């Protein structure tokens, strides 16, 4: 694991982890998102999107505008550090990102941009400590 | 319409159609299954299978033993005239078949072979009635 983490979503609007740490010696980090509840993505789909705190709302706004075929992230958004696909019950998806995109010590927002989800389904990630 | 019919399955094991009539001016017929329920396929997957009424249980049984990955139909089962894949909530799938495989006035059985679902409903398909 070390430069890898699994976070879970279910049929409610919270990840099991509300905080995450990337170890400073990680060159890359992989997040595995598992949807462990039984609802289909048309009813309760979820993703994991990482941005700087200040970019969360713009990414969530343009995100819900992007539609499910874009996994509710605006195509090629420069403000998205990393994002998974939208998954439904029984599915999972991973994303590996460049740890040099993270300023050490800065708190970063990770949230779900699925319709209705962005303000509830969220947490914070930081590079080591 | 024409030589196509759409049938919907929800999160109770039933179709909105109990009798499907293929018309004799059709060379091919296309069924569009829509799973209008909201649960994921691991929880409430549905499909549509067409066999002769004498073969409904044998195909269903071997199908149950074929597993979700094999769309609950045994691969290359000579008794299956047509089948879709097992789909989840919010999904759709279609199968087109050649009407020369059907005999005048003979009643055929359509069913979902997802374990149990076949035994709690009955649906018939005939050529022009
Ligand atoms: Cu969500
Ligand atoms: Cu079914």
Swiss-Prot record, chains A, B:
Disulfide linkage: 3-26
NCBIfam families: azurin (TIGR02695)
Coiled-coil residues: none
Molecular function, one GO term: copper ion binding
Residues where Cu cation binds: 46, 112, 117, 121
An annotated GO cellular component: periplasmic space
Superkingdom as given in the UniProt entry: Bacteria
Principal location class: periplasm
Protein name: Azurin
Native organism taxonomy: Bacteria, Pseudomonadati, Pseudomonadota, Betaproteobacteria, Burkholderiales
Organism from which the protein derives: Achromobacter denitrificans
Localization in the cell: Periplasm
